Amino acid sequence: PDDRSWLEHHVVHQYWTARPSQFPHSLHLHSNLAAVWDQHLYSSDPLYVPDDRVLVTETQVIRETLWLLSGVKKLFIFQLIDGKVTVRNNIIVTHLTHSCLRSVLEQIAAYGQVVFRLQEFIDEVMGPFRTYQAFMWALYKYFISFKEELAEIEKCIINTTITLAIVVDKLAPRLSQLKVLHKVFSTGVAETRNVVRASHLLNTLYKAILEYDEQTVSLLFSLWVETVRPYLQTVDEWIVHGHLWDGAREFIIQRTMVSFLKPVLKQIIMAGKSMQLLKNLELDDVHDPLLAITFELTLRSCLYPHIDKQYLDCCGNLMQTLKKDYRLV
Amino acid sequence: MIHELLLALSGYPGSIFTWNKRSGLQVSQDFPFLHPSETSVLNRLCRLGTDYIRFTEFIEQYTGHVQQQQGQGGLHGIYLRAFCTGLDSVLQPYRQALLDLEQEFLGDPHLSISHVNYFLDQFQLLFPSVMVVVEQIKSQKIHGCQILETVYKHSCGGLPPVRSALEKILAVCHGVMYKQLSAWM
Amino acid sequence: GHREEPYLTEAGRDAFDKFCRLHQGELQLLAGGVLQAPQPVLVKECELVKDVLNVLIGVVSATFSLPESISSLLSEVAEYGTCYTRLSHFSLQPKGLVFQAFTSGLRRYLQYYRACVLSTPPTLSLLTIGFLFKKLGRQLRYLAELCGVAFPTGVKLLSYLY
């Protein structure tokens, strides 16, 4: 009556709120499949064994699953057991004989678990390590753009019909890269000291790019650059300010290693120590123009001139100023 | 469903999303026609509004509320007042975004809340981060120039947007010390 | 085909008059049947905006003197107007000579505040009003603290200002 009547008419409210379906059906087997299945059961004489499901149409399930894939939680579809999404079987569409439907929703739930755990990790930093913090932001950066596409698609439902086969085949070039993400995160959750807990992940990042060396390798590279930002800054600090800032010794070398800057590292340490002993008597903004003018192999060998020039300048200036007014020779 | 969400987040509390000092803003959550889908999204959205209420309330409370009757360093003082002055200017594009969103809703009358929650995801990280800075200042009774380090130690984070956001508040707090130093020196 | 039939969260300009109808009925049940809410809906937006613009000149609205949460918004902009009148009333005098000069100096900002309203808005929205006269309105409220509405006057005021 007057708002409940409008609810019943012009809003759905018939599985997500318990009020059995009055969706108009124009029967005849392509969508009378439940009833013909019941008659076939009766001819096989079950006897009676009655199942209870709530009877939805298909498209509502599609929008709910797209919501599940976007990253929100707590939906009516997909019972949640201990943290893991699992397909519910108390939900029926007339055709697909209730067994196909279970499989398709189980596959979408199999993807939804992978999305949920990552968003769980992202939520757990919102309620000094600084490398985890730089990692989740890049993960988040993937996720917001990823959510944008699905949110676009869901709008076009309101304005045309869209089926399951459309939505699974549409998300192929994203679920491809999601499988990579499932493998990268496995070693980022495998762990005492904060320096090994970061280097173990970062070295896996350095190694994994060569495995795919189109569109995946750019994703890995763009993920790579936003995660080595802390170490780059700290190294540049040790260069130009002479001192290494300690965060319970976040750097690998004590005042566990990475391959990333090892083959020039001796020139770097010999740079840091020399600068503070000189005073006793922009690197990112250079790295980015290099991208304007193989990936993390030969391109990485162009990074070392930036630090090497600075090193040469520092050590030569110290050697020069030691030979006059104390005149070692 | 759409437009008093702007009303509630704007800082005029709603009769649906109930403002409490112990539950923030909160949906009534007893309708015989609510669904589990909308619940999580409203919960995600109400956090930013709770933080916004706390921020704007504190800024109005401790900036220019006296004619000078010593004071308290964490509840008065010119560094603290300048901190609030930086803080509301940082909060400005959120207000601009809400003003844009109403025009979007007016242009297309059939719109859902997930569209909104998708757009506001960039404040979703920025607003909880900055709360702990002012929380530490308020609780720990930090007096004088030690305020200047506190946002400075918290501009060492691995999030570039939050770091750049806090840097402006620190830049505002430099100028008052500059102004007095120009006279004493 | 007939369609997929709009969700609740979709369309918040009509499902919302329905949502509020439901919740108002729930409230009246939970009260007992008598609580009597004052104008829980009416009228429009721009008409209310124009009345609010008239408040900043000094004529208070038809609910004030010297959607239901509109009352929460309205009270924020109304009280501003009620302090505005409490400054021009404090500047009504033509005593102390320096106080007269200071009072005529206060009129130079009250004239500004009168000049901005009813010229600059191209019929702005309601939320723009609350946002816009917040960064200006608290500054106006500070002057109510500066004035009385004992009180230092004459040189005793002028030293107090120094």
Does residue C43 have a cis peptide bond before it, meaning omega lies within 30 degrees of 0? yes
Helix (H) or strand (E) holding B18: none
Residue whose token pair is 């740079």: A271
Secondary structure (3-state) at B30: coil
Across the interface, whether the CB atoms of B114 and A70 are under 8 A apart is answered yes
Amino acid present at C145: E
Amino acid present at C124: L
Across the interface, whether the CB atoms of B14 and C69 are under 8 A apart is answered yes
* Cα A252 to Cα B57: distance, rounded to the nearest angstrom: 45
Q: How far C6 CA lies from chain A's nearest CA (Å)?
A: 5
Evaluate the CA torsion angle C27, C32, C33, C36 in order and state its sign: negative
Angle at C8 between CA C5 and CA C11, to 5 degrees: 85
Angle at A194 between CA A192 and CA A199, to 5 degrees: 110
Asked if C93 and C70 count as a contact pair (C-beta separation under 8 A), the reply is no
**Other beta carbons less than 10 A from residue A84's beta carbon:** 12
Secondary structure (3-state) at C3: coil
| Residue C78: partners with Cβ closer than 8 Å, 6 or more residues away | C52, C55, C60, C61, C64
- Which chain B positions have a beta carbon within 8 Å of C69's beta carbon? 4, 7-8, 12-15
* Cα C159 to Cα C148: distance, rounded to the nearest angstrom: 16
Across the interface, whether the CB atoms of C69 and B111 are under 8 A apart is answered no
Resolved by: cryo-EM
The tokens for C143 are 């002057």
Helices (H), chain B: 3-9, 36-62, 78-90, 92-107, 113-119, 123-140, 146-153, 160-184
Across the interface, whether the CB atoms of A158 and C15 are under 8 A apart is answered no
Asked if A242 and A278 count as a contact pair (C-beta separation under 8 A), the reply is yes
Q: Which of B31, B35, B104 to mutate to test the interface with A (most CBs of A within 10 A)?
A: B35
Residues of C (99-118) whose Cβ lies below 8 Å from A:
none
Across the interface, whether the CB atoms of B118 and A148 are under 8 A apart is answered yes
- Which chain C positions have a beta carbon within 8 Å of A4's beta carbon? 22
Name the residue among C136, A111, A233, C67 with its Cα closest to residue B17: C67
Q: How far B160 CA lies from chain A's nearest CA (Å)?
A: 9
**Each residue of A249-275: b (16+ CB within 10 Å) or e?**
ebbbeeeeebebbeeeeeebeebbbbb
Whether B32 contacts chain C with CB within 8 A:
no
Resolution in A: 5.3
Q: How far C97 CA lies from chain B's nearest CA (Å)?
A: 23
Instruction: Output Rg (C-alpha) for chain A, integer angstroms.
Output: 30
Across the interface, whether the CB atoms of B38 and C146 are under 8 A apart is answered no
The tokens for A295 are 């990936």
Q: By CA distance, what is C27's nearest residue in B?
A: B15
Whether A67 contacts chain B with CB within 8 A:
yes
What contacts 24+ positions apart, CB below 8 Å, involve A232-238?
A232/A283, A232/A284, A232/A287, A233/A284, A235/A261, A235/A268, A235/A283, A235/A307, A236/A282, A236/A283, A238/A268, A238/A271, A238/A272
Does residue A68 have a cis peptide bond before it, meaning omega lies within 30 degrees of 0? no
Asked if B94 and B176 count as a contact pair (C-beta separation under 8 A), the reply is no
* Cα A303 to Cα A296: distance, rounded to the nearest angstrom: 10
